[PDB]
Design a protein around this ligand. Structure first.
Ligand SMILES: NC(=O)C1=CN([C@@H]2O[C@H](COP(=O)(O)OP(=O)(O)OC[C@H]3O[C@@H](n4cnc5c(N)ncnc54)[C@H](O)[C@@H]3O)[C@@H](O)[C@H]2O)C=CC1
Ligand SMILES: Cc1cc2nc3c(=O)[nH]c(=O)nc-3n(C[C@H](O)[C@H](O)[C@H](O)COP(=O)(O)O)c2cc1C
Ligand code: SF4
Ligand code: FES
Lengths: 62, 217, 433
């Protein structure tokens, strides 16, 4: 079986904002690394572009 | 019901990429004329006719013919395979000299297309979807062929034979296997889509160019 | 007496397709003899707006089967050019069971179709016309090509069509056995060398169509009646039929009739009068009638009680919950197994589905299996309601209207012949313990 010796291997905490997590870590004395949230950028979708008269976006199959 | 024909190609001694196929020079001229009917930036539109031409030259479509069509038109082979498997008139397997197609949809079914199917089966001694040992005749069931007024009907090698009785189809088969060309169309003294007797419409002579043209024109 | 109320008897002088039965020369000489290609130069020089106005005031609706107003649809293409060429696509696929009219139009007077192509292209400002003919109509396509060749040598089409200074081409493209390729977007996709799979709307063909260019897809009957409408006026065409149901129509009467045939008749003619006058009556007498499918396989069937007074136009058949469709009348007498007929239609739709979208691809096959079991009687009565719900889950949820055309016949059969299905299930249960 898989054996461990550290008691915090399963500890995961949930927070509403980054600032809340930072405050909790600071008041508990833990040094932390923060990663900014990654949000997918808005994209421009066009179903008509599948059948362009002169562009490369025209699809060869459906 | 079930289609019965697979849509996966497995290489075979008589159907493989090295099977010989090539267009004739006359067919190449016809292909050139076909491609000249579409805008210069869209040559894939010629896939449907050219593929058909290959079959008209070969009788069926080996994978070599599809590869040749794809190479000629600069289209990827998978697109040609897609077209060849989507459309039911393409033969991805050899067929007899005469391809017999019997419409069995409801308008033709109401006028006893089953008798025509049974007469063909009895005359040729083969099941639907089977090809005779001689190989001249191949039989299949098709959907509505657009001649429901003249029912029951049959299509043999892009020829329409209409208003069929079992005797009519027996004579058609007899003169087809005797090397003769049967007369296409109805077989009831009708020869068109008019009523069988009387000609209830269009009896008065048609009128000339300027019969009822409006003023100021 | 204005506002006629009884329709169904028009003489030959008011008929458009005067060579419907092929008793006169279909070549150019015969067409000119019958009034074709007459004063087309003046009509072309009247401008696209005049032609669109004549088509609008005519009240002509789409003869393909949907009945969309033709003038508005054609004027959707009356925009200024943006660089892309403009095209007219004529629909000649003719896949609906029971329908045979366009075949006769193409083979017996293709010059009407060619002149209609020219007039419609001028009205829409189209560079060329593409005619998508059914692949099984080889001889009809060859006749159309011969007529196009005669028109090209006569100067009626091509460079400087007639003397109008308008350049216009006509091309013939043949399909390869696909009913779904009759749908306008699937037809466009098949022209471009792809599988006959419909594309979603919007965009509509007037914005992005064949080769990504503005195009209009029109039925061959709609295109072919247009030059006559232009020559005789929209008022003459609108004098026939009820309001919003103007003009004449081709009817294909098939099934259990003494003389199955194709005729031209005024729109709002009653169904019984048409059947007993042009088709020789129902086999065995009118009292032998069981059911009628009035507008091709996609329309719901109606029992004999409804066919006594129903009229053959869009509105009256909509009020009868059946629709007009392609005006292809299929007659089933009292010796007909109605369940077997509807199951055969569902099998046709299962074999014609393109498979693109989930509801059609799965549900049509599901209903085919259910109806096959219904024919024998294996099912239980509750399944009937289930079947109804299944059809409701297909209709209005698919890319194209093929799903609707498969769902509607079972809805009609359940609506009008539920006791037949129930008694079939009863007999199957009683026979097999
Ligand atoms: N002639 C034949 O062989 C067959 C005919 N049909 C008939 O086809 C009918 C259904 O076909 P659909 O095309 O799906 O009907 P639809 O109502 O969706 O479209 C009919 C025409 O009207 C145009 N249109 C409709 N709304 C428009 C809008 N808001 N903007 C621009 N254009 C618009 C469309 O471009 C189309 O060309 C059925 O009623 C059926 O009877 C079906 C199978 C075969
Ligand atoms: C599955 C399906 C098949 C169709 N097949 C045809 C056809 O074969 N011929 C036709 O004219 N219309 C057919 N239609 C209807 C087309 O949409 C119609 O031709 C097109 O809208 C032309 O409009 P119009 O009637 O105003 O000329 C079909 C529609 C569907 C959903
Ligand atoms: S409804 Fe049927 S034919 Fe139409 S797009 Fe969907 S799967 Fe294809
Ligand atoms: S039903 Fe047989 S040709 Fe249409």
């Amino acid at each position: 079986w898989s054996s461990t010796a550290d008691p915090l291997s399963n500890l995961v905490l949930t927070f509403s904002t980054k600032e809340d997590a930072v405050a909790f870590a600071e008041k508990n004395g833990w040094s932390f690394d923060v990663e900014e949230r990654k949000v997918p950028k808005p994209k421009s979708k066009s179903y008509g572009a599948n059948f362009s008269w002169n562009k490369r976006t025209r699809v060869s199959t459906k | 019901g079930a289609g019965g024909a697979l849509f996966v190609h497995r290489d075979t001694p008589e159907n493989n990429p090295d099977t010989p196929f090539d267009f004739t020079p006359e067919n190449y001229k016809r292909i050139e004329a076909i491609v000249k009917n579409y805008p210069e930036g869209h040559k894939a539109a010629a896939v449907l006719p050219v593929l058909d031409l290959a079959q008209r030259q070969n009788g069926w479509l080996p994978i070599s013919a599809m590869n040749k069509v794809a190479e000629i038109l600069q289209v990827p082979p998978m697109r040609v395979y897609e077209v060849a498997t989507f459309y039911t008139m393409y033969n991805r397997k050899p067929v007899g000299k005469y391809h017999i197609q019997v419409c069995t949809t409801t308008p033709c079914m109401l006028r006893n297309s089953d008798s025509i199917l049974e007469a063909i089966q009895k005359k040729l001694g083969i099941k639907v979807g089977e090809t005779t040992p001689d190989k001249l005749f191949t039989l299949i069931e098709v959907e509505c062929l657009g001649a429901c007024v003249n029912a029951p009907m049959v299509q043999i090698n892009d020829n329409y034979y209409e208003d069929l009785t079992p005797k009519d189809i027996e004579e058609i088969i007899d003169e087809l296997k005797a090397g003769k060309i049967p007369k296409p169309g109805p077989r009831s003294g009708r020869f068109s889509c008019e009523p069988a007797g009387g000609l209830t419409s269009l009896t008065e002579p048609p009128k000339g160019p300027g019969f009822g043209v409006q003023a100021g024109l | 007496a204005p506002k006629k109320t009884s329709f169904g008897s028009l003489k030959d002088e008011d008929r458009i397709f005067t060579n419907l039965y092929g008793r006169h020369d279909w070549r150019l000489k015969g067409a000119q003899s019958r009034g074709d290609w007459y004063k087309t130069k003046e009509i072309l020089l009247k401008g696209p707006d005049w032609i669109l106005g004549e088509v609008k005031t005519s009240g002509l609706r789409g003869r393909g089967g949907a009945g969309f107003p033709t003038g508005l649809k054609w004027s959707f293409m009356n925009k200024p050019s943006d660089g892309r060429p403009k095209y007219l696509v004529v629909n000649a696929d003719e896949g609906e069971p029971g329908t045979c009219k366009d075949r006769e139009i193409i083979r017996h007077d293709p010059h009407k179709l060619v002149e209609g192509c020219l007039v419609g292209g001028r009205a829409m400002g189209a560079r060329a016309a593409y005619i998508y003919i059914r692949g099984e109509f080889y001889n009809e396509a060859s006749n159309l090509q011969v007529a196009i060749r005669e028109a090209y040598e006569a100067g009626l089409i091509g460079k400087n069509a007639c003397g109008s200074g308008y350049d216009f081409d006509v091309f013939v493209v043949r399909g390869a056995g696909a009913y779904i390729c009759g749908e306008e977007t699937a037809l466009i996709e098949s022209i471009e060398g792809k599988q006959g799979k419909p594309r979603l709307k919007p965009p509509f063909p007037a914005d992005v169509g064949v080769f990504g260019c503005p195009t209009t897809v029109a039925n061959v009957e709609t295109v072919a009646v247009s030059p006559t409408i232009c020559r005789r006026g929209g008022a003459w065409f609108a004098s026939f039929g009820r309001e919003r149901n103007s003009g004449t129509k081709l009817f294909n009467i098939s099934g259990h009739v003494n003389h199955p045939c194709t005729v031209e008749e005024e729109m709002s003619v009653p169904l019984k009068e048409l059947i007993e006058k042009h088709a020789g009556g129902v086999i065995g007498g009118w009292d032998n009638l069981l059911a009628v499918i009035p507008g091709g396989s996609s329309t719901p069937l109606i029992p004999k009680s409804v066919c006594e007074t129903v009229l053959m136009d869009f509105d009256a058949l909509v009020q009868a919950q059946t629709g007009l469709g392609t005006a292809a009348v299929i007659v089933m007498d009292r010796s007909t197994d109605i369940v077997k007929a509807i199951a055969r239609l569902i099998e046709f739709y299962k074999h014609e589905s393109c498979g693109q979208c989930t509801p059609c691809r799965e549900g049509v096959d599901w209903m085919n299996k259910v109806m096959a079991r219904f024919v024998k009687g294996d099912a239980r009565p509750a399944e009937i309601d289930s079947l109804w719900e299944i059809s409701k889950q297909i209709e209005g949820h698919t890319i194209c209207a093929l799903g609707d055309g498969a769902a509607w016949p079972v809805q009609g059969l359940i609506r009008h012949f539920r006791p037949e299905l129930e008694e079939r299930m009863q007999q199957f249960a009683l026979q097999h313990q």
